Design a protein around this nucleic acid. Sequence first.
RNA 1: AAGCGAGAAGAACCAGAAGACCAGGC
Lengths: 190, 217, 48
Amino acid sequence: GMEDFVRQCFNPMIVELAEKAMKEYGEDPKIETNKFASICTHLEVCFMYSDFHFIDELKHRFEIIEGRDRTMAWTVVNSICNTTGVEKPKFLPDLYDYKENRFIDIGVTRREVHIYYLEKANKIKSEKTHIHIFSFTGEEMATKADYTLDEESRARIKTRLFTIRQEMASRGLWDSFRQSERGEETIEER
Amino acid sequence: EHNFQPGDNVEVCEGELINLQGKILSVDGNKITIMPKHEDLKDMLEFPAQELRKYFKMGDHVKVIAGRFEGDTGLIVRVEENFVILFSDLTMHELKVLPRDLQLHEWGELVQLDPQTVGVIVRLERETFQVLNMYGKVVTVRHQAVTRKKDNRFAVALDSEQNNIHVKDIVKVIDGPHSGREGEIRHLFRSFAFLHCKKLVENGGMFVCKTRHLVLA
Amino acid sequence: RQLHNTLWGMVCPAETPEGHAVGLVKNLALMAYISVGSQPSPILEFLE
RNA sequence: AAGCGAGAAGAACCAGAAGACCAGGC
Ligand SMILES: [Mg+2]
């Protein structure tokens, strides 16, 4: 029993965004709950990233592109690229920083940071798309070693990741989260 | 405590041998029988393991042995009553220690392989980076074996028609292996440029052409 | 290792390994029987 | 030459004995 743990160990609106997104994409959230937990933690970390940080001479500095439906997310991306002139990233980013006027992709991983980082960098082809990567073990690393955040904010994010890691281990499913199959897509039209 | 290690520059703290300076030779188990070969001294003397201290002269080498500044190295620059100040070799960090405390890469970033092999990273691996060099060969190099090179975004060169070309310019290739291709100049040198073409799938569209094989598109 | 004349009927002249144990490892013949042993007391009594 | 309704990708992804002895092929 893990889904109840995810429900009770997350912000209600974060889990709401996760479940609505998944339902949009057509996946049964009662079976593949590992993707449920992963999406929830990713959304949570993105919110923390865009939490308490404001651009002013108060306005949110970071707009959370993830967590909203596909058309709305792409509308946000297109509007930002049309006003600021930033190149439209073909892959949906996760956030946009107005001060540096550049999109950011946030990824939380349990494997070593650099392998995930290089994987993403190669996939994106480095088309002017800064990316930041967190890990459950409690280390971070980003493109050009730029985190665009105060040390205390990143410390809070990493501590939250470590705490959820320890709670989930207390539940004993840490090894279960270490498994994720390609796809069990066999829904015949009946 | 009292510990002595070979190779250290020591001094004599008492006796008729006072102020004599020398380099330790050997060491023993309990009675160290430390023997320092004094500077400009053909003979070898004998001292107890408490009579010698690690003294150093102005302009010599020193390396911390223990304490808060362990691992730092440099050169003492002043001799106060007992404190000795020096500046770290690797960085400008200030260092104050006793004399006895001393002894005697992102996807598509230009990298230096060797003076004449300023390559461009085209693939990130766990331990290595593929690097397309200026000759058109792809080499694999360890992450720490290359240095990040400062890109000259304002570089200017001549193309095949002696037109001025600049970083970010779109050029056509009219000679050499890539003749007929078109690309964006990413890194520019007088004789060659690293170009990008999204239609080119090899090396993620990163190729290299001589500047005399280019014409501004 | 040589096939002694006394191996007639007691050991197989043909059956023997051809490696480094030629002639040392032998094989009994079909009708060969190795004695089991017996007490000589009755023989001694008969002789006396 | 054909020509009679719409698309694109959230999250992240290996194993050693060693030694002795015996049988055996060459
Ligand atoms: Mg992402």
